[PDB]
DNA sequence: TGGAGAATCCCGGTGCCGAGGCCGCTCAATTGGTCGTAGACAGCTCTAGCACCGCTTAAACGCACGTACGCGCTGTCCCCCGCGTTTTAACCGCCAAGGGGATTACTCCCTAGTCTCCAGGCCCGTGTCAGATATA
DNA sequence: TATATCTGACACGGCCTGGAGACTAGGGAGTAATCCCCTTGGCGGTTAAAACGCGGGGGACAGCGCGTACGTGCGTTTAAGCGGTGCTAGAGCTGTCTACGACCAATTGAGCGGCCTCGGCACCGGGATTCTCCA
């Protein structure tokens, strides 16, 4: 049959998700995560929809920027694979 | 009386001088606001609005779109060095990222 | 009671977020660390948003509260009011 | 009721790009940008007035706040149109 | 007539560490620390007043500012100390 | 007029309620300042001052010195996680850094 | 002129020893000089702007403190 | 009686990490500050406290940058720090 | 080096809904005049910052030796990518309760403003103790 | 780690100005009531995406050789640094006046809510153009 080399599908996915502006995390699991986080602080709490999309946009942007710094850390270690010490190094340098 | 002339019209501006003056009074910045301060602030705000909008319209024309979308504003801000320095701490909603694949990842 | 919904942030969703950041290969230990990072960031935003809501004696967290919580920590979000 | 820069950004767009429109989300982003830059310059001018024991925000405070906040060519240009605007406002 | 927080840090230091002095540079640092924390809390209280369309800063605004800025145990103990001081002021 | 009693003595504090009230009034934060806000903020400032001075005195006795220097304040701030989170963007002059050597550099 | 060479190689070595660096390359020093030049240019430009707003010809330590506070580099013990 | 390569560096680390004194000579930093400030305004006066403030801020910034540079060096499985480590640290920090 | 399945780019028809133009009006900007006060400007002191010479001495600079270490090459095995199948939970639509955001009247307590009074913090002077130096 | 000495920063001890006491006034916010957007719980189809599994290939990782470039010690240079003097810009304080901005009131047109409309653009379908892998 037809089988692509490892990297071509990943590079096409990189080009697609860098051209697009859509939200990548599914909306309802993010809403449930937001509500279970907020229920540890105040009980019987409501949320506007725009608050949940604001949290989703901020979280997606923060994770994408963290993955950019993670990729640069992985390239700095002569690698093309991101590993958790790259994430820990990026958060240590930023100061989180 | 005389004809009511807008303060933005005699200063050659489109942004409101009176609204900026009201927001400077009610914003608890200082006890007094000078006369030239809202004119200067409206001029700077109009200049920065024009600088973002010109590059956003250029990005929309380069993508064959008549209309400015948030992706066009992100492409305007992050492709210019000065506006990216001004808005490096700011996330544009529905703006995406610039197309930037690293050189070691490409075959 | 909502419990254990951090698994709703799926492995293909983290893969898509890494593809947006320009990542060619992802190790299998990335996803738990990404879930922990997302959880820490979300508690940091949501605690301030709930504090802003509680100061107004309200029960609904608005988009203003999230915008002010992100503006506080230097992660200002446009488009949701300001 | 709700007050925003819903007509002036469109005026600047029409005098810059006369055949280009703007969407609702993009216009909300532009309104947020104008409010954020206004808050930055006004807070810097208030802080400068408090540093020099002044109870007035003049055009000089806005000028040095623009020089402090904006990067180089943007600050130089914004100083130039601000000076031109106050000169035209005083002369007319 | 440069006002400073030197004698109050003297009083607190002698209250908790009686056989312990302090240097002049340490007091410049402590004066800057008190001024910085004061400016931070008062600015957040001003923002809380402006967000909820209020013209006064009360104990609730300072409480919410202390909860926003200070980390967890620091925020809890500072809220407890402030509430104790407020009820001691009101009851006496 | 009766006997004058200070507002700091009524709240059981050493930090000045009246000075904090005056700094809130002339600092252009709000148009009005309530009665309990200077008391509350004086208490918060007194508690944070007390915590920094406790850890600084402990660090001073750890170095067998009875006077607090800036190095003792730096060791007080950065060895506590909450004060490191509060003062992470703060440089203390003549404070130095804590002695840390990574494990790969040890022989 | 040519005052960036006054920030010598042992001074950069000393600052790296304070940072816990065990081994230093020979090209660290030019990069450190450029980094210090950029940082000093930013803080000095902001302090000069603060001075010329105050109609003064003397850069006060208040101006340096406010210049560093504008960049989130708050300095304690210099009258801040 | 030559020491091993590395132990004098370790005593230097433990010496300069236990001290508060400024690691840059005062007069070259004064000349550097005046040379940089000449490009913005001609014939500026400088207080001594302003130059000491600039030196303290610059030394703290360089010490923090060298700590992050060392972290990048160990992340690259290496003891020697290189300009790519400084560039990576400033890129992650946002400069 | 050249051919085939698959993705990519380009072009024409279709429908829709969301920006965009227009009108009533109301509310906030505009004009006119008054008054107090913040700040512009001149004068003067005396603080402190620049300028310069000597010296002696710590710090820097150049050179040489060499060994730890960076870096490239090779091998391996394992772990993650690519894709087919299944299942499972997201998504959209419509749907009702019903809690709570948002607005309005009022009414009252809380806080700005003012005069007076006094006592706490502040500049200056003095002396005495806590580190740094010194040595083994 | 232990025994003597020195010195310079630091803790303590009359005036003045700002904080407290008492009163007055007015307006901001708390409380009550109500009205309706809008938030959540849920049923049901559906179809798209998450999950599981299997092969395999390419890359993380470990080991090893080597060549070189920083570490370190030592001798020589040089200019930081401390003391001391001198002098002149200018930081800062005070007095005087004047222009300028807050404030109040009457007027009016600019902008915002509401409503109707038409074309920009997403979507679907077909045709031409790479495109990437393999023999």
Residue numbers in the entry:
A (entry chain A): 38 to 133
B (entry chain G), F (entry chain C): 11 to 117
C (entry chain B): 21 to 102
D (entry chain H), E (entry chain D): 30 to 121
G (entry chain F): 23 to 102
H (entry chain E): 39 to 133
Original paper wording:
The engagement of a DNA glycosylase with a damaged DNA base marks the initiation of base excision repair. Here, we report cryo-electron microscopy structures of nucleosomes bearing a deoxyinosine (DI) in various geometric positions and structures of them in complex with the DNA glycosylase AAG. The apo nucleosome structures show that the presence of a DI alone perturbs nucleosomal DNA globally, leading to a general weakening of the interface between DNA and the histone core and greater flexibility for the exit/entry of the nucleosomal DNA. Mechanistically, local distortion augmentation, translation/rotational register shift and partial opening of the nucleosome are employed by AAG to cope with substrate sites in fully exposed, occluded and completely buried positions, respectively.
To investigate how AAG acts in positions with different solution accessibility and histone microenvironment, we sampled different superhelical locations (SHLs) and rotational orientations on nucleosome, and a series of single DI-containing DNAs with a DI located in various geometric positions (–30, –50, –53 and –55) were prepared. –30 at SHL-3 and –50 at SHL-5 both represent solvent-facing positions with high solution accessibility, whereas –53 and –55 at SHL-5 represent occluded and embedded positions with medium and low solution accessibility, respectively. In the AAG–NCP–50AP complex, a DI was introduced into the position of –50 at SHL-5, which could be regarded as a roughly equivalent position of –30 in terms of solution accessibility. Subsequently, the structures of apo NCP–50I and AAG–NCP–50AP complexes were solved at resolutions of 2.9 Å and 3.0 Å, respectively. The presence of DI at –50 causes a noticeable movement of both strands away from the histone core: at –55 to –45 (–50 ± 5 positions) of SHL-5, the calculated RMSDs for the DNA backbone are 0.8 Å and 0.9 Å for the damaged and undamaged strands, respectively. Globally, the buried surface area between the DNA and the histone core decreases from 7134 Å2 to 6248 Å2 in the presence of DI at –50, and further decreases to 5977 Å2 after engaging with AAG.
